[PDB]
């Protein structure tokens, strides 16, 4: 038990010192390693519950039972007198650098998960390389280090959402006494994009500086795993070579899907292209109904665009469907048009994109509704948001033996291990896990600590909160109402709900009964909160704190006994009382 | 035991029915009471864990042990056959309205707590009167029903705060691509005040309508308790009379203090006057350093005023002083001037307020610093925010026997009972309680339920979260750092902290390292979170949800295992790791 932990910790740590906080001989060894700039993990046996047993068990490796004991890649190096000997004789540097492989860790993929994993491992003395390459889009778009979120995801999407929110702030300012005239103000797309791209560039740079300062080797090259320990790399000059590593972390993420119809790849774009587009999209069709489709259609409409969303079946498949419909009704009331139960058949080119004068082209989109009627309309831009997929055939040779599921994602144990013992996977390509940046960062940092510092904590993937940044934001944590009922039966489920109006909306003359919130609870388990849902401004700020309480097992009684902060939107969660079964109206 | 709960419930309830959910005779009585428009409390005995025991003790009042049983004001009325006898003989209405007093409940004070208590009591058949009178300010300001929060507190203050925040929204919108020129835009005070006062008017009216629809008698008259059950009321016509009630709730609140110096009452104003002031204050001096003083100085500066705050000793006494200093440094950098370690001696009038042309007057303020030097400067408006106090001599006859503390607040047990067994106190006049609107409302609602519906739940006054709506907002829940160190010792306290920058501030070129958060934790109790603090935008929305987790005993490990929502300010709480003891910098 203890002994199986110790063997696993010793075998995979790069450099590790066993010690106690008081021990002055340990302090002498720590001082030598600091002076020679040798990074290492440290385990202070006196701070651990079973430190006595661990100490006895070290002798199975070193034949000694005292501290300090220093190990390098599974080999006992010595006590303090022996380490000082190697230092004094100029032998320590070569001992700590001796390895069967080029690297202790190779990370394939330089995004949210891979960067976090690599930097954390480097802190404990693991010799680390991170590989990142960005395959250009069909029209040639490419970007720098940091992955999907940084370059073509959460960061530019929320900045453009903020640009759209400011249009309503300009409107609201008149009612609060400011002299501006909202009608004579317009928006400049390219000025926005320049500011967004300047911030993204500061993040690209900041990650390169962070890897340099952690002594991580950064290769801007494409990686391919050809055997358990061998990674083939291809250069920007197409030079091919092979590097070896003890542990491998696959963190290569996903890219957007295109439907298989004429004209889609040639004349449409995806979110990969949208966030650096040199011209305003103009009259735009968004095909799809994911959070990506709706977030992009939302800010384009707030920025003055003529926008249509073409919806195959429902909005936000997989989210609470009452909330999804409230999200769509708000967008439709504020300018977004919807072509419901409709699918595209072909895109035709009427005008080529005008790169010189910085203007879009023109397209004809033909499609059909599910009853067979025809759709035909002209747009300047067509954005496909119909899902994302990994392409692990470009990353992972089939003979390595890494098992994939029917969607092409990696099948992992609860500690991220693949079917190949030294190979792990994190982030969007880990099958069945929520596909979010904070999850990938947590999994990558926690994994690096288990590999190289003897940690045991696992990543907890349950009840992870989300926020959809539509024009009215939607935050959630836990089960949808229909999933709770499916799992426990309608008679065991109580739903408390209420409309509400932000105080900021009163003087602004905004809508009375559009914002909404509900708690979905289990009667037979002391009214446990199974899911929390809120539609309103700053919904992500509102939701985050409640995710700690749900993690801890909060009940309806816990919300009732906590006092609200006034005046806020979030305080409405502390006084809920109208149930859905009562039939009483939730309006204010 | 169970029996002394039953006695108190029966003696105090106005009209109460003991029932079971599966009982068709109970349903016949319920339907008769509903048709007769008779409101009542209901105790469904089959949903209480010891409903069997309660059934037995009912016989001690009624000599029967079956269900249903009706009681009115402590007297057993009858089973199903007897109640239906009274109904068809036209005797029921006379029986349910028989009482020793004019009212089951008299509430003195129509504010946050009083209105909540009165409406909740009326839902259980208690015959309720609510008295409210607003004594005018020295310059004659008055307002309508709803209390300090509604008319001259949280509601107008947060709306003028929002008006000030929108100025930075105007500035930010240029960097996000909008074509306005912030430098050519001005603010109109009187347009703001009209919008703010129109919302307050809709609240005044809403409360009058709510009372009518709950059958609550509203008297706009000044009340005075002269004996345990007798309340003397004075008319708008100065007509005096007496009414009697069984239970009394004191809920009369506080009003601003003035310093005892020449000119203060005559020529200064307070927050009571500010929110309906017909003219812009102009160059303004705010005297004091409480949350009221700083919130007012803050939005006046954001609206373009020339604003000075005179501080006697420190900012935000009783709040975490590291956070108070960060709050004040932000306002000093954004244009509020501070006269530190200073106190006023007299206000001299130079120019009378011009009611005609809607202009302030002009004043000369004389004061001195603690080192002896002198202060002398002219201002158009002087606002005093040097605390608030009750005036219970105006409310309570000394002979009634209600004990007050040395500050003039009412001394209560943990169920709000005074030293006079039928008189209770709630809200700001209850000694030692946090003086907050949601606290008053919960105290009032919970008390009404104990008096008239047999409830037992008490109000929990511990760890109530707060937010100060300064230009950069400050949210808190639990102990300050210095209070935790004093209570437990420096060696048992660990503080995790970090600066942060909102994503929205990047493209707007706002400051890198002014927003800040920390967790104050107890080492020897599994790193329990004792206090949470955050300085940043939307701080009330950020803080609220964590108050539920802190109520449930959150530890640092609970915050670490919960995953963040990205991109948000609040997510920075889920990955804190820099300790104060380590000396590592908290900057980004
Ligand atoms: C439009 C959009 C908006 C989003 N908004 C949010 C949001 O608000 N909040 C949120 O939590 N999540 C959001 N997400 C999800 C978030 O972007 C992902 O969950 C996260 O970025 C995935 O991290 P990752 O490390 O798994 O992969 P990635 O971040 O995609 O990084 C993988 C990297 O590896 C590179 N790579 C691939 N193959 C190779 C190879 N063979 N060799 C070398 N390098 C390779 C890729 O080019 C890429 O740079 C959004 C996603 C999108 C598309
Ligand atoms: C400037 C300011 C800002 C504030 N901001 C906030 C905030 O953001 N959040 C928050 O939670 N709290 C805030 N507060 C505090 C909040 O307003 C109070 O805690 C709350 O109003 C207390 O309610 P109450 O029922 O005890 O008294 P009140 O709301 O003051 O109501 C008592 C009422 O009784 C009346 N009355 C008095 N004597 C008599 C009598 N003899 N007969 C009849 N009627 C009488 C009074 O005139 C008044 O109408 C703020 C306070 C101020 C001054
Ligand atoms: C598909 C794609 C490739 C090209 N990837 C290597 C590469 C090419 C260009 C680069 C780069 C890396 O860094 C900067 O520019 C090879 C084989 N199959
Ligand atoms: C698995 C492992 C064990 C031994 N304790 C592990 C441990 C816990 C916390 C740690 C650590 C190591 O290094 C840094 O923090 C016993 C049974 N099963
Ligand atoms: C006209 C004006 C008002 C405003 N307050 C009147 C008033 C004046 C003095 C009072 C009072 C009430 O109770 C005790 O003394 C209400 C209704 N009608």
């Amino acid at each position: 038990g203890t002994s199986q932990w110790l063997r696993k910790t010793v075998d995979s740590a790069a450099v590790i010192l066993f010690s106690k906080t008081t021990c002055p001989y340990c302090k002498k060894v720590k001082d030598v390693l600091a002076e020679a700039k040798i990074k290492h993990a440290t385990i202070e046996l006196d701070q651990l519950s079973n430190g006595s047993a661990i100490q006895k068990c070290l002798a199975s490796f070193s034949k000694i039972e005292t501290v300090p004991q220093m190990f390098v890649r599974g080999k006992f190096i010595g006590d303090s007198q022996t380490v000082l000997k190697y230092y004094s004789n100029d032998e320590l540097a070569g001992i700590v650098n001796e390895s069967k492989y080029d690297y202790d860790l190779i990370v394939i993929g330089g995004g949210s998960g891979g960067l976090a994993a690599g930097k954390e491992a480097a802190k404990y003395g693991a010799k680390t390389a991170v590989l990142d390459y960005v395959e250009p889009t069909p029209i040639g778009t490419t970007w720098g280090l940091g992955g999907t979120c940084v370059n073509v995801g959460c960061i530019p999407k929320k900045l453009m959402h903020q640009a759209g929110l400011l249009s309503h702030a300009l409107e609201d300012a008149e009612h609060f006494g400011w002299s501006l005239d909202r009608s004579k103000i317009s928006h400049n797309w390219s000025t926005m994009v320049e500011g967004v791209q300047s911030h993204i560039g500061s993040l690209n740079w900041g990650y390169k500086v962070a890897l340099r300062d952690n002594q991580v080797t950064y290769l801007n090259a494409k990686g391919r795993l050809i055997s358990p320990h061998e990674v083939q790399i291809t250069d920007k000059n197409q030079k091919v070579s092979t590097i070896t590593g003890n542990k491998i972390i696959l963190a290569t993420g996903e890219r957007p899907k295109y439907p298989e119809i004429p004209g889609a790849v040639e004349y449409g774009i995806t979110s990969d292209d949208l966030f650096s587009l040199p011209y305003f999209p103009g009259k735009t069709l968004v095909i799809g109904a994911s959070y990506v489709a709706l977030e992009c259609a939302g800010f384009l409409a707030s920025l003055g665009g003529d926008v249509t969303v073409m919806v195959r079946s429902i909005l936000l498949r997989g989210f609470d469907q009452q909330m999804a419909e409230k999200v769509g009704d708000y967008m439709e009331n504020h300018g977004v048009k919807f072509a419901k139960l409709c699918v595209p058949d072909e895109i035709k080119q009427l005008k080529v994109v005008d790169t010189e004068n910085n203007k879009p082209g023109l397209l004809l989109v033909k499609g059909h509704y599910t009853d067979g009627k025809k759709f035909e309309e002209e747009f300047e831009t067509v954005i496909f948001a119909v899902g994302r997929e990994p392409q692990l055939s470009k990353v992972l040779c089939e003979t390595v033996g890494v098992k994939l599921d029917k969607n092409g994602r990696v099948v992992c144990t609860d500690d991220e291990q693949t079917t190949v013992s030294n190979v792990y996977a994190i982030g969007d390509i880990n099958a069945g896990k929520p596909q979010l940046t904070p999850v990938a960062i947590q999994a990558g940092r926690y994994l690096a600590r288990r590999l190289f510092a003897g940690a045991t904590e696992l990543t907890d993937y349950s009840n992870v909160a989300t926020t959809v940044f539509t024009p009215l934001e939607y935050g959630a944590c836990g089960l949808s109402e229909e999933d709770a009922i499916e799992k426990y039966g309608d008679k065991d489920i109580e739903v408390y709900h209420s409309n509400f109006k932000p105080l900021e909306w009163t003087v602004a003359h905004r809508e009375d009964n559009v914002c909404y919130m509900k708690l979905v609870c289990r009667k037979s388990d002391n009214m446990r909160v199974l899911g929390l849902h809120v539609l309103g401004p700053n919904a992500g700020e509102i939701t985050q704190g409640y995710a700690v309480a749900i993690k801890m097992g909060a009940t309806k009684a816990d919300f009732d006994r906590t006092i609200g902060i006034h005046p806020t939107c979030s305080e409405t969660f502390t006084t809920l009382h109208v149930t859905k079964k009562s039939g009483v109206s939730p309006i204010v």
Side-chain angles (χ1 to χ4, degrees), chain A:
Chain A
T2 279
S3 85
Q4 309 156 309
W5 169 78
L6 183 52
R7 179 201 190 130
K8 197 158 136 223
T9 299
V10 166
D11 286 342
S12 62
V15 183
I16 187 158
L17 178 66
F18 290 87
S19 151
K20 309 175 136 173
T21 53
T22 44
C23 168
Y25 280 105
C26 310
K27 197 54 163 243
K28 189 70 226 282
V29 169
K30 309 218 264 223
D31 292 349
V32 160
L33 303 171
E35 187 187 59
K37 323 174 272 283
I38 297 130
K39 294 174 287 166
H40 60 93
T42 305
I43 296 263
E44 303 280 12
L45 299 182
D46 57 300
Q47 324 270 69
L48 284 179
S49 155
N50 58 346
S52 266
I54 284 155
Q55 216 174 141
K56 317 222 209 73
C57 202
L58 282 163
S60 315
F61 305 84
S62 51
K63 307 209 149 169
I64 70 168
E65 301 179 41
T66 42
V67 299
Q69 313 198 14
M70 185 193 166
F71 297 72
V72 173
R73 296 181 186 89
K75 185 190 170 166
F76 173 63
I77 294 312
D79 53 17
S80 51
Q81 170 152 338
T82 302
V83 177
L84 274 45
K85 190 277 197 173
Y86 294 138
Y87 193 45
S88 183
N89 285 258
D90 210 279
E91 308 172 284
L92 196 46
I95 283 173
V96 299
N97 285 2
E98 161 182 27
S99 177
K100 148 146 65 162
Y101 307 108
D102 302 307
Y103 298 97
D104 294 296
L105 172 58
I106 302 179
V107 184
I108 308 182
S112 296
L115 292 171
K119 281 183 288 153
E120 186 75 12
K123 300 190 185 7
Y124 306 103
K127 205 230 199 323
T128 304
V130 313
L131 283 37
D132 201 49
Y133 170 63
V134 180
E135 205 95 84
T137 70
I139 68 175
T141 312
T142 202
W143 50 83
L145 189 61
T148 291
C149 185
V150 166
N151 295 287
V152 288
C154 347
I155 300 296
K157 162 283 288 283
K158 210 195 178 191
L159 288 165
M160 281 169 203
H161 170 64
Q162 176 66 4
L165 297 176
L166 284 160
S167 75
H168 289 249
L170 298 185
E171 283 161 41
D172 287 359
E174 325 214 66
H175 298 280
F176 281 89
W178 294 92
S179 63
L180 75 155
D181 190 356
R182 170 66 185 88
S183 292
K184 301 164 180 174
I185 296 151
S186 65
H187 187 256
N188 180 327
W189 169 267
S190 72
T191 295
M192 185 179 73
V193 168
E194 283 301 310
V196 170
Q197 289 295 331
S198 196
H199 175 66
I200 290 173
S202 83
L203 299 171
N204 299 145
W205 184 249
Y207 285 113
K208 287 150 141 189
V209 173
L211 291 183
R212 187 198 70 205
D213 292 356
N214 280 268
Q215 302 73 46
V216 173
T217 296
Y218 167 48
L219 305 178
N220 178 32
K222 155 134 91 183
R224 208 183 128 80
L225 187 68
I226 62 168
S227 70
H229 297 287
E230 289 185 298
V231 178
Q232 182 193 270
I233 55 181
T234 306
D235 248 348
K236 41 142 163 203
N237 312 130
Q238 313 305 303
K239 190 187 182 227
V240 171
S241 54
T242 287
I243 53 173
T244 61
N246 186 17
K247 312 298 186 187
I248 311 293
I249 288 172
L250 311 175
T252 53
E254 295 189 321
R255 295 295 285 277
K257 287 173 176 188
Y258 288 78
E260 293 165 79
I261 64 183
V265 174
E266 298 90 347
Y267 310 123
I269 65 174
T270 73
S271 66
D272 280 353
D273 306 298
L274 177 61
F275 297 114
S276 61
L277 211 62
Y279 48 83
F280 181 58
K283 176 181 191 211
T284 296
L285 173 66
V286 179
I287 296 165
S290 59
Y291 75 87
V292 170
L294 296 191
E295 286 176 341
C296 293
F299 66 69
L300 289 172
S302 295
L303 299 176
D306 179 339
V307 188
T308 308
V309 185
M310 186 189 276
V311 182
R312 172 177 307 260
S313 42
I314 60 183
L315 307 179
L316 297 184
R317 185 172 288 283
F319 295 80
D320 183 291
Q321 283 295 290
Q322 170 195 33
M323 301 319 281
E325 187 170 2
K326 291 177 179 297
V327 164
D329 292 347
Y330 184 89
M331 284 153 89
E332 186 173 65
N333 279 338
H334 295 261
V336 183
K337 282 163 273 157
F338 288 82
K340 293 187 211 62
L341 310 168
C342 191
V343 160
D345 295 309
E346 182 194 19
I347 318 296
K348 289 129 172 84
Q349 183 178 60
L350 305 175
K351 283 195 208 192
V352 174
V353 167
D354 190 349
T355 54
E356 269 188 277
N357 290 5
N358 208 43
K359 289 190 73 273
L362 185 66
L363 312 160
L364 177 63
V365 176
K366 316 173 65 54
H368 63 273
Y369 301 90
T370 57
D371 62 6
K373 308 230 208 333
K374 295 327 235 173
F375 175 101
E376 187 171 314
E377 190 158 359
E378 279 178 20
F379 298 89
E380 301 175 274
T381 298
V382 171
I383 311 187
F384 292 106
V386 299
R388 296 175 57 81
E389 75 195 345
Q391 294 111 37
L392 283 168
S393 97
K394 307 175 171 170
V395 179
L396 184 57
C397 179
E398 221 173 56
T399 54
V400 182
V402 174
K403 175 192 222 159
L404 309 185
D405 76 0
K406 54 150 208 272
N407 315 141
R409 284 176 197 101
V410 188
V411 179
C412 301
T413 60
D414 70 1
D415 68 340
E416 286 74 61
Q417 194 182 45
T418 71
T419 47
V420 178
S421 60
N422 66 300
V423 180
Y424 296 75
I426 61 176
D428 286 350
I429 67 181
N430 180 335
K433 300 320 185 297
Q435 302 190 307
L436 306 159
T437 282
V439 175
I441 295 178
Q442 181 105 328
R445 293 191 183 138
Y446 276 35
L447 172 63
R449 295 176 189 159
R450 297 194 305 276
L451 294 170
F452 300 115
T456 44
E457 202 80 89
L458 303 178
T459 294
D460 183 354
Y461 296 93
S462 70
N463 291 313
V464 176
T466 56
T467 293
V468 178
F469 297 98
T470 39
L472 200 56
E473 277 166 29
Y474 167 42
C477 180
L479 299 180
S480 64
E481 174 172 342
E482 58 269 46
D483 286 3
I485 288 169
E486 169 158 39
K487 183 175 168 106
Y488 294 113
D490 186 56
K491 288 191 334 293
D492 204 19
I493 298 299
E494 194 86 285
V495 183
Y496 303 89
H497 65 158
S498 181
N499 290 120
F500 67 95
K501 183 168 198 189
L503 171 64
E504 295 74 14
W505 283 21
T506 59
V507 164
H509 305 284
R510 290 192 180 281
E511 301 100 305
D512 288 329
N513 284 298
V514 153
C515 301
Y516 181 76
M517 71 171 51
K518 70 183 180 181
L519 293 177
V520 175
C521 301
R522 195 186 173 190
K523 295 191 208 187
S524 63
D525 183 29
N526 305 343
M527 216 49 93
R528 195 82 54 195
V529 174
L530 297 176
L532 174 151
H533 304 266
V534 55
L535 171 70
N538 309 306
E541 304 304 349
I542 289 173
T543 301
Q544 175 74 96
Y546 294 108
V548 186
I550 294 163
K551 176 59 61 194
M552 291 167 82
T555 69
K556 181 57 159 69
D558 291 320
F559 280 68
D560 291 336
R561 71 201 173 100
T562 305
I563 308 297
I565 306 177
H566 181 70
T568 62
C569 299
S570 186
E571 73 175 313
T572 300
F573 276 112
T574 75
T575 55
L576 290 174
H577 63 107
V578 174
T579 68
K580 275 184 178 178
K581 278 242 167 58
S582 74
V584 172
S585 176
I587 63 156
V588 192

Short mmCIF file of all heavy atoms in Angstrom, two decimals, chain A residues 265-284:
data_model
loop_
_atom_site.label_atom_id
_atom_site.label_comp_id
_atom_site.label_asym_id
_atom_site.label_seq_id
_atom_site.Cartn_x
_atom_site.Cartn_y
_atom_site.Cartn_z
N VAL A 265 -16.07 24.07 -47.98
CA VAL A 265 -14.65 24.31 -47.68
C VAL A 265 -14.10 25.48 -48.49
O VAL A 265 -13.25 26.25 -48.01
CB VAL A 265 -13.86 23.01 -47.92
CG1 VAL A 265 -12.37 23.24 -47.78
CG2 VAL A 265 -14.34 21.93 -46.95
N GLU A 266 -14.59 25.65 -49.72
CA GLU A 266 -14.09 26.67 -50.64
C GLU A 266 -14.57 28.07 -50.28
O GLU A 266 -13.81 29.04 -50.40
CB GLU A 266 -14.53 26.33 -52.08
CG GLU A 266 -13.99 25.00 -52.64
CD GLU A 266 -14.90 23.80 -52.35
OE1 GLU A 266 -15.84 23.90 -51.53
OE2 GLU A 266 -14.67 22.73 -52.96
N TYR A 267 -15.82 28.22 -49.87
CA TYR A 267 -16.40 29.55 -49.76
C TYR A 267 -16.89 29.93 -48.36
O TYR A 267 -17.16 31.12 -48.14
CB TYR A 267 -17.56 29.70 -50.75
CG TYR A 267 -17.21 29.27 -52.16
CD1 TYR A 267 -17.95 28.29 -52.81
CD2 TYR A 267 -16.11 29.82 -52.83
CE1 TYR A 267 -17.63 27.87 -54.09
CE2 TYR A 267 -15.78 29.40 -54.12
CZ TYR A 267 -16.55 28.43 -54.74
OH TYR A 267 -16.26 27.99 -56.01
N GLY A 268 -17.05 28.98 -47.42
CA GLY A 268 -17.38 29.33 -46.04
C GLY A 268 -16.14 29.46 -45.15
O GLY A 268 -15.01 29.19 -45.58
N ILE A 269 -16.36 29.90 -43.91
CA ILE A 269 -15.29 29.99 -42.89
C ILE A 269 -15.77 29.29 -41.62
O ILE A 269 -16.91 28.82 -41.54
CB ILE A 269 -14.88 31.45 -42.59
CG1 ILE A 269 -16.03 32.22 -41.96
CG2 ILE A 269 -14.41 32.16 -43.90
CD1 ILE A 269 -15.65 33.66 -41.49
N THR A 270 -14.88 29.21 -40.63
CA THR A 270 -15.24 28.72 -39.30
C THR A 270 -14.80 29.75 -38.25
O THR A 270 -14.25 30.81 -38.57
CB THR A 270 -14.62 27.34 -38.97
OG1 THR A 270 -13.21 27.47 -38.73
CG2 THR A 270 -14.88 26.30 -40.07
N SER A 271 -15.03 29.42 -36.98
CA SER A 271 -14.54 30.26 -35.90
C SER A 271 -13.01 30.41 -35.95
O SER A 271 -12.49 31.44 -35.49
CB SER A 271 -15.02 29.72 -34.55
OG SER A 271 -14.47 28.44 -34.24
N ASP A 272 -12.27 29.43 -36.50
CA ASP A 272 -10.81 29.57 -36.62
C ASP A 272 -10.42 30.83 -37.41
O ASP A 272 -9.37 31.43 -37.16
CB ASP A 272 -10.18 28.36 -37.33
CG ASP A 272 -9.99 27.13 -36.43
OD1 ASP A 272 -10.22 27.18 -35.20
OD2 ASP A 272 -9.53 26.09 -36.97
N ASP A 273 -11.24 31.23 -38.40
CA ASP A 273 -10.94 32.37 -39.26
C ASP A 273 -11.57 33.67 -38.75
O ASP A 273 -11.06 34.75 -39.08
CB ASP A 273 -11.46 32.10 -40.69
CG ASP A 273 -10.92 30.78 -41.28
OD1 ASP A 273 -9.67 30.66 -41.45
OD2 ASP A 273 -11.75 29.86 -41.56
N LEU A 274 -12.66 33.58 -37.97
CA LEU A 274 -13.49 34.75 -37.65
C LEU A 274 -12.74 35.76 -36.80
O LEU A 274 -12.86 36.98 -37.01
CB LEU A 274 -14.76 34.30 -36.91
CG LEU A 274 -15.71 35.42 -36.43
CD1 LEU A 274 -16.25 36.27 -37.62
CD2 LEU A 274 -16.86 34.91 -35.49
N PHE A 275 -11.96 35.29 -35.83
CA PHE A 275 -11.40 36.20 -34.83
C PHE A 275 -10.21 37.03 -35.33
O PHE A 275 -9.78 37.94 -34.61
CB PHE A 275 -11.02 35.40 -33.58
CG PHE A 275 -12.20 34.75 -32.92
CD1 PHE A 275 -12.33 33.37 -32.88
CD2 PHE A 275 -13.22 35.54 -32.38
CE1 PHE A 275 -13.44 32.78 -32.28
CE2 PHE A 275 -14.33 34.95 -31.78
CZ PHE A 275 -14.44 33.56 -31.73
N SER A 276 -9.67 36.75 -36.53
CA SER A 276 -8.68 37.63 -37.15
C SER A 276 -9.13 38.15 -38.51
O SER A 276 -8.30 38.64 -39.29
CB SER A 276 -7.32 36.93 -37.28
OG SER A 276 -7.38 35.76 -38.09
N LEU A 277 -10.43 38.09 -38.82
CA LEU A 277 -10.90 38.43 -40.17
C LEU A 277 -10.58 39.90 -40.48
O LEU A 277 -10.89 40.78 -39.67
CB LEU A 277 -12.41 38.18 -40.29
CG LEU A 277 -13.01 37.77 -41.64
CD1 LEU A 277 -12.43 36.42 -42.14
CD2 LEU A 277 -14.53 37.70 -41.56
N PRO A 278 -9.96 40.20 -41.62
CA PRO A 278 -9.60 41.60 -41.90
C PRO A 278 -10.77 42.52 -42.25
O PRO A 278 -10.61 43.75 -42.15
CB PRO A 278 -8.62 41.50 -43.08
CG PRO A 278 -8.77 40.13 -43.62
CD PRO A 278 -9.33 39.25 -42.54
N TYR A 279 -11.93 41.98 -42.64
CA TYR A 279 -13.10 42.77 -43.04
C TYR A 279 -14.30 42.36 -42.18
O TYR A 279 -14.36 41.24 -41.68
CB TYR A 279 -13.41 42.55 -44.54
CG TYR A 279 -13.42 41.09 -44.94
CD1 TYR A 279 -14.54 40.29 -44.75
CD2 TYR A 279 -12.26 40.48 -45.42
CE1 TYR A 279 -14.54 38.96 -45.09
CE2 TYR A 279 -12.25 39.14 -45.76
CZ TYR A 279 -13.38 38.38 -45.58
OH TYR A 279 -13.35 37.05 -45.92
N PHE A 280 -15.24 43.29 -42.01
CA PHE A 280 -16.47 42.96 -41.29
C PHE A 280 -17.24 41.89 -42.09
O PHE A 280 -17.35 42.01 -43.31
CB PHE A 280 -17.35 44.20 -41.08
CG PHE A 280 -18.65 43.93 -40.31
CD1 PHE A 280 -18.62 43.38 -39.04
CD2 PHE A 280 -19.88 44.23 -40.88
CE1 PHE A 280 -19.80 43.13 -38.33
CE2 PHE A 280 -21.07 43.98 -40.19
CZ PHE A 280 -21.02 43.43 -38.91
N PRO A 281 -17.73 40.83 -41.44
CA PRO A 281 -18.40 39.76 -42.20
C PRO A 281 -19.56 40.24 -43.07
O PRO A 281 -19.86 39.58 -44.07
CB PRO A 281 -18.90 38.81 -41.10
CG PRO A 281 -18.01 39.04 -39.94
CD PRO A 281 -17.32 40.38 -40.10
N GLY A 282 -20.23 41.34 -42.69
CA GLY A 282 -21.44 41.77 -43.40
C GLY A 282 -22.65 40.92 -43.05
O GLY A 282 -22.72 40.31 -41.98
N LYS A 283 -23.61 40.86 -43.98
CA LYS A 283 -24.75 39.97 -43.81
C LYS A 283 -24.29 38.52 -43.75
O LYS A 283 -23.71 38.01 -44.72
CB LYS A 283 -25.77 40.16 -44.93
CG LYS A 283 -26.92 39.20 -44.86
CD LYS A 283 -27.91 39.41 -46.01
CE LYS A 283 -29.20 38.62 -45.77
NZ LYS A 283 -29.81 38.18 -47.05
N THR A 284 -24.59 37.86 -42.63
CA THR A 284 -23.94 36.61 -42.23
C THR A 284 -24.96 35.52 -41.96
O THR A 284 -26.00 35.77 -41.34
CB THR A 284 -23.10 36.84 -40.97
OG1 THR A 284 -22.05 37.75 -41.29
CG2 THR A 284 -22.50 35.52 -40.44
#
